[PDB]
Amino acid sequence: REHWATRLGLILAMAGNAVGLGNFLRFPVQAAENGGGAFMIPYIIAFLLVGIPLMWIEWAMGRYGGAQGHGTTPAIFYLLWRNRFAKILGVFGLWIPLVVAIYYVYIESWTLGFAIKFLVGLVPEPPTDPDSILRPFKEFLYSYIGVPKGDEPILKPSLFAYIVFLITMFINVSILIRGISKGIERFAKIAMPTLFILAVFLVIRVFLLETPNGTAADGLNFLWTPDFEKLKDPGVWIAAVGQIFATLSLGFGAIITYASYVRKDQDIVLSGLTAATLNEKAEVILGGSISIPAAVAFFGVANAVAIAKAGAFNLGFITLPAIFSQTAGGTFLGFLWFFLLFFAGLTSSIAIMQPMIAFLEDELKLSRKHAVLWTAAIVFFSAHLVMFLNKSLDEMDFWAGTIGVVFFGLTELIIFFWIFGADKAWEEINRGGIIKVPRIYYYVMRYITPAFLAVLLVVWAREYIPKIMEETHWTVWITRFYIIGLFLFLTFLVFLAERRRN
Ligand code: MET
Ligand code: NA
Ligand code: NA
C-alpha cells in the first residue's frame, strides 16, 4: 500500500481536505442566516459532540482497513461486520463522494474562471446606488453559468465556462495521477501555506474597510455577539450540525480514504485533532472575517443578512466582488479572493475523487493512471447534468451533501462503535496515538453522538417525506433517476470486486 511521506504532509493533506469552499462560502451564509453570534454556540457544541468524535472514528476506520489494503467503506464495513448488507451500506462511501465531486468540481471551476477574468481585468465596471453596483456583477455571474431570465429548466453555460471546467478537470487529474505522497502531499505542502497567507492578507485588507454605512468591525461584533433567543430554534442546531458535517468532510468517505494511507503504527489522534483545529481556525477566524464583515461594512448588518439569505453564491460571487470594485485595486483584490477560493476547492476535490480512485485500485486492481482517468471520465460526463440542468446541483447537494452525509455518519458510527465493539473500537482509535482521547469521549461516541444524529434524521425525514413526492420540476426527477443509476452502477462494481475476490 502507498503511504504518506511525512507527518506534516499528512496534516496538510487532511487540512486541505477539510478546508474548502465550505469555509469561505457556506459558513458565512449559514452564520448570517442564523443570527451571527447565536449560531456560534451550537456550532461549537456540535463541533465537540459530533465533529471531533466522528473525525477520530473515520481516521480509525481508515487506518484499520488500510492496514489490510482497503481504503473504501464497501470493504471496510465488511471487515468490521461480516455481512452483504455491510457492503451495500458501504456503497454510500463511493456514491456520496462521487455525487458531491460532480457539482463541487464545477463550482471550483467557477472560482478558477473568475480568478482568471479578474486577473486579466475582464470584469464589469460599476459607476452610489447599491443595485446599480450589484446588477452588473449579477449579470456577470448569470452570463458565466448561463442562468435563464425566469425560472427555466435549461442552463446555457458560456463556452469559456465549459473550457475552464475542462481545465479544472485537467488539473485535478494532473495532481491525482502522481499518487498520495508525490501528488496530493507535495501539492498540499504548497497550496496550504499559500492559502493561509492569502486568507490572512484578505482578512486584514477587509478589516480596513470602513464607510458611512458601517465597518468590518461591526460585522465581527455581529458574528461574535451571543444571542440566546435562538437557542430554542431547532433550525439553528440543524444548521450547525450540517455545517460541521460539511466543513469537516464527515460522512463523505474522504477522511477514511486518506486515513487508509496512514501506516498502521502511526498516530491518528493528535494528527486528526490538529487537522480539525486547523479547519476550525480557517473557518471561524479567516472565512468568517472576510465576506460578512465586508458586506456589513458597505450595506450594514440588516442588508448583509438580507444578501446572505438571498443565496450562497450571491455573497461570494456577486456581492463581495462588487464591494471590491468600489475600492482602489479592488479588481486585483477580487482576483486574490477567487484564487484563494480556487485552491480551497481543489485541495478538497482531489480528496473527494480519491475514494473512487482508491476503490478502483484496491478492489478492481486497476493501476493508478487508469483509475484516475476513468474516475475523471465519469465525473466529467455526469457533470453535464449539473451544467445544463437548472436545480440539478441543488438536488445533488441535498441528497448527497446534506442527508447522505448524516445518514452515512450514523451508519459508520454504529457499525464501528456498536457492532464491531465499543472497546475494540476505542483501543483501535487510541493505539499508536501520540496523545490519548479523553475518556469522556468514549461515552460521547457510544451514546450522545448516535442519539443526536438519529433524532436529526428523524426530524428531517418527518419534514421532507411529504415534500418529496409532490415536486413540480422535471429536472429534479431526471437528476434523482440519474444518481440512483449511479448507485446501481457502483453496486454492480462492488459485486464484480466481490466475485473477483472469490
Ligand atoms: C472535501 S468535500 C467536503 C467539504 C469541505 N470540507 C469544505 O469545507 O468545503
Ligand atoms: Na480544500
Ligand atoms: Na472545511
Between CA 238 and CA 385 the distance in angstroms is 29
Give me 21's grid cell.
469552499
Q: Which of 348, 349, 356, 402 to mutate to test the pocket of ligand 1 (most atoms within 8 A of CB)?
A: 348
Q: Is 7 assigned to a binding site? A: no
Helix (H) or strand (E) segment spanning residue 215: strand 214-215
Between CA 141 and CA 316 the distance in angstroms is 11
DSSP letters along 338-406, please?
Answer: HHHHHHHHHHHHHHHHHHHHHHHHHTS---HHHHHHHHHHHHHHHHHHHHHBTTHHHHHHHIIIIIIHH
Nearest CA to ligand 1 atom 3: 249
Of all ligands present, the nearest one to the C-alpha of 283 is 3
Closest-lying ligand 1 atom to the alpha carbon of residue 100 = 2
Ligand 3: distance of its center to the CA of 82 in Å? 33
Resolution in angstrom units: 3.0
Helix (H) or strand (E) segment spanning residue 492: helix 474-501
**Sole residue written with cell 454492480:** 492
Among 247, 275, 249, 279, which Cα is nearest to 25's?
247
Please give the method by which this entry was determined: X-ray
354 CB within 6 A, ligand 1:
no
Q: Which of 98, 252, 286 to mutate to test the pocket of ligand 1 (most atoms within 8 A of CB)?
A: 252
- The CA–CA distances, whole Å, from 456 to 26, 198, 240, 452 equal 20, 36, 12, 6
Ligand 2: distance of its center to the CA of 469 in Å? 35
- The CA–CA distances, whole Å, from 131 to 54, 128, 304, 322, 323 equal 44, 9, 14, 10, 12
251 CB within 6 A, ligand 1:
no
Ligand 1: distance of its center to the CA of 496 in Å? 30
Closest-lying ligand 1 atom to the alpha carbon of residue 351 = 1
Between CA 286 and CA 280 the distance in angstroms is 9
Segments making up each domain of the chain, as ranges: 1-502
Residue 90 phi/psi, 5° resolution?
Answer: -70, -25
Of all ligands present, the nearest one to the C-alpha of 351 is 1
Ligand 2: distance of its center to the CA of 344 in Å? 4
Among 139, 115, 136, which Cα is nearest to 127's?
136
Give me 369's grid cell.
493512471
347 CB within 6 A, ligand 1:
no
Between CA 8 and CA 67 the distance in angstroms is 20
Between CA 444 and CA 457 the distance in angstroms is 18
348 CB within 6 A, ligand 1:
yes
Are 93 and 358 contacting, i.e. CB atoms less than 8 angstroms apart?
A: no
- In sequence order, the β-bridge partners of residue 210 are 215
350 CB within 6 A, ligand 1:
no
Nearest CA to ligand 1 atom 1: 348
